[PDB]
């Protein structure tokens, strides 16, 4: 019926087996079904796992079942009716991702599916009434290093022979930076280090797929979020709202973050998971750090569209008062999708959604720095 139905699916489960059955059960009452997942690789995985299902079309930026990503579905539902329709059901995978677009998308699918006179449903599936699924296809062994991540990867390199291994590191730089640890692993273990960041994902990813015999060590930021073990810093590089703007800080990753970083190893093979002893899984934030700037941009959009908002910190509530985009400023952001920050979209799109002059664009961003200093306008 017109209902939203969560399904707690463990990370990398035999979802493939189950999603084609959900699409045909939704062809009961509705005429199209949209399938979306965070990154493109999941969208291709979903496309693969629907191979034998007749009228299936992809949307990677007539038909009856579209698969695409969270982002470019949002970009589409907003530009082409869709939400005014009553015969479109949705299936969303990895609803627990830390993107503002997933958040607003979830709200809009919820609105158009529980709508009055609706004849469509939604199926949400996540690895996170407070529950986090830590099951996998194969068993996973949880261990604890007390002495640092590099040295626990040395212990592993010698106690075990070469394996495929991966290290989840907060930032590209720092004393625990991807660059910094890869050099130290390079110079100790016989493993070859493949660094993966958004800054370098596209070039090195190719390198990741060869069979490395002396050993392979993926040192990765959260973009990566097939191998035999995972070493977790249990730390991330959020940007956070600080009441003068935003600042970049290292944080204990959220329960949902580590649940996905772990969920990389148990899918096709036994795997081991190494977290630091001094990490409070019980006590870290479940889904989002209380005042992360992703929770600001999501609520900013949700308020303009007069949708239900998300639990957030006090510094965000404060910031949602200094910064109040209009329905169309957040449409232009969500639909032309060439400004990473909603804050900067407010500089280039007027209150009515039209493009601003060059001198108007520059006046507004300087005025905005008087009260909100977004530190993402640099790096």
Residue numbers in the entry: 338 to 398, 406 to 472, 480 to 576, 582 to 735
The publication says:
ALSV belongs to the distinct Jingmenvirus group within the Flaviviridae family with segmented RNA genomes. While segments 2 and 4 of the ALSV genome encode the VP1–VP3 proteins of unknown origin, segments 1 and 3 encode the NS2b–NS3 and NS5 proteins, which are related to Flavivirus nonstructural proteins, suggesting an evolutionary link between segmented and unsegmented viruses within the Flaviviridae family. Here, the enzymatic activity of the ALSV NS3-like helicase (NS3-Hel) was characterized and its crystal structure was determined to 2.9 Å resolution. ALSV NS3-Hel exhibits an ATPase activity that is comparable to those measured for Flavivirus NS3 helicases.
